[PDB]
Amino acid sequence: IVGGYTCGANTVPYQVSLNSGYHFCGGSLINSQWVVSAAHCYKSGIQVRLGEDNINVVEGNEQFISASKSIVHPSYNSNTLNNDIMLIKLKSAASLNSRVASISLPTSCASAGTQCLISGWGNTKSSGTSYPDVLKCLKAPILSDSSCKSAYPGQITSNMFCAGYLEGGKDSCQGDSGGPVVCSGKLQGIVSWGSGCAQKNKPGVYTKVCNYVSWIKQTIASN
Ligand SMILES: NC(=[NH2+])c1ccc2[nH]c(-c3cc(OC(F)(F)F)ccc3[O-])nc2c1
Ligand SMILES: [Ca+2]
């Protein structure tokens, strides 16, 4: 997260870190046995780490659960990142409490101007790599479709939305991938891609979760 702030231990209880011997993507807990992340974060040997704040130290509240299976959207395209969403089922259910909780899926899509919270352990430098130990947060607005499409001509599908600042300085970045964009208590986006990080006129692009709620409910119901 570039230009963000320290969220504070366990203030984002649905945030999860996907770990394969190191933190490589974020994710969101949506029920005690399922997590939603980005299809581009797929890999085998994923351990889901819940209740995390400092990812390099055990300080209490963490639950490390192995993924039983990851379900990448059947129509995911890695060259366009269209349908960039993946569901991960946990080997056992997580214990939910105030530090570990799920986030609700949206009943409606959010409008431009909606302010959302984006969080992650991704890079905090737009030029170079600085990875924090603790969870960073950023409050960003969803942009209008015209500004999004004007920023990435021909690269935005209807399953993507842009959120961020065109002046630059504040944005999600590598390492934040797969994580949550929550607006009004609902999971509205998944950190997907962008050109560089916090670059002027290059806002972040997010998977539009409201378009996948029936797919998520149907897939969880049959697995
Ligand atoms: N500017 C953004 N809002 C943004 C968001 C997620 C990203 N994820 C990545 C990303 C970058 C990776 O390494 C690469 F820069 F060499 F391509 C690898 C995985 C990523 O998800 N870049 C990203 C940029
Ligand atoms: Ca920790």
UniProtKB/Swiss-Prot annotation:
The keyword Lyase does not apply. This is Serine protease 1. Subsequent cleavage after Lys-125 leads to alpha-trypsin. Further cleavage after Lys-170 yields pseudotrypsin. A cleavage may also occur after Arg-99. Not sulfated on tyrosine residue(s). It is an enzyme of class 3 (hydrolase). One of its GO terms (cellular component) is extracellular space. One of its GO terms (biological process) is digestion. Its EC number is 3.4.21.4. It comes from the Eukaryota. Synthesized in the acinar cells of the pancreas. Its main location: secreted. It catalyses: Preferential cleavage: Arg-|-Xaa, Lys-|-Xaa. The active site is at H40 (charge relay system), D84 (charge relay system), S177 (charge relay system). It comes from Bos taurus (Bovine).
